[PDB]
């Protein structure tokens with residue numbers, strides 16, 4: 169992707185992606201608006217299993233469109249299974265999408281409601297061997313989406329907030345060991361699920377989306393720090409990293425299932 173030029177600006181934003189990535193107008197694109205009254209409770213869904221006790225984080229990176237907290241996924245240590253999934257999915261990284269204002273920032277919406285941000289914990293299906301092969305499969309990834317609203321601070325997020333100063337610009341990374349992602353989960357694991365895609369190019373249709381109904385609360389100061397990051401690299405005109413979210417796409421021929429009544 170050394171020649172990719174997509175972004176979230178006015179000239180390379182979501183409405184332009186289809187030119188370089190035609191699958192942008194595909195049949196199972198994400199995110200989507202979750203119509204709570206049309207999502208049907210599916211009694212056959214199993215409880216979700218999030219096992220992060222052995223998660224091993226390694227680094228945090230500003231990649232020019234978000235920041236990723238990467239994990240060592242060379243062994244089965246932080247896995248997601250159950251719920252709508254068959255098999256075991258291993259955690260590889262998490263990142264967020266956020267807005268320039270508290271009134272927007274999430275990718276998925278709930279009855280058109282936009283949250284201040286959205287956390288994505290990305291997992292790949294171990295039956296495919298590695299992440300690169302998994303994204304080429306319809307059931308290659310499971311992304312756990314969690315909404316963020318502004319209110320009380322999330323203690324578990326502060327370590328992330330404090331390290332952002334060190335990765336202000338595109339390409340900067342910092343050691344980020346021993347970060348426990350369990351500190352970013354809400355109390356309830358009730359969720360909605362549907363088949364979709366990566367929400368940034370290459371927009372591959374390889375994701376089983378699992379979006380939690382309960383958002384976590386983060387403080388205004390915490391999200392404010394996210395907004396001080398830069399999309400640009402060091403030494404270039406500063407462009408604040410805000411509004412790095414893709415808007416809701418057509419649901420087309422898909423049903424969103426709810427794990428709860």
Ligand SMILES: NS(=O)(=O)c1ccc(CC[n+]2c(-c3ccccc3)cc(-c3ccccc3)cc2-c2ccccc2)cc1
Nearest residue numbers: 169172231234236263288290300303311365366367368369
């Ligand atoms: N929002 S999401 O649906 O959860 C989603 C998950 C994974 C991905 C692919 C991961 N990814 C990201 C990437 C994208 C978004 C967030 C974090 C990293 C960047 C480059 C990148 C490209 C150019 C320069 C710098 C970074 C690449 C990839 C990527 C692609 C395919 C295979 C392997 C990695 C895309 C979307």
Ligand SMILES: [Zn+2]
Nearest residue numbers: 263265288367
């Ligand atoms: Zn994402």
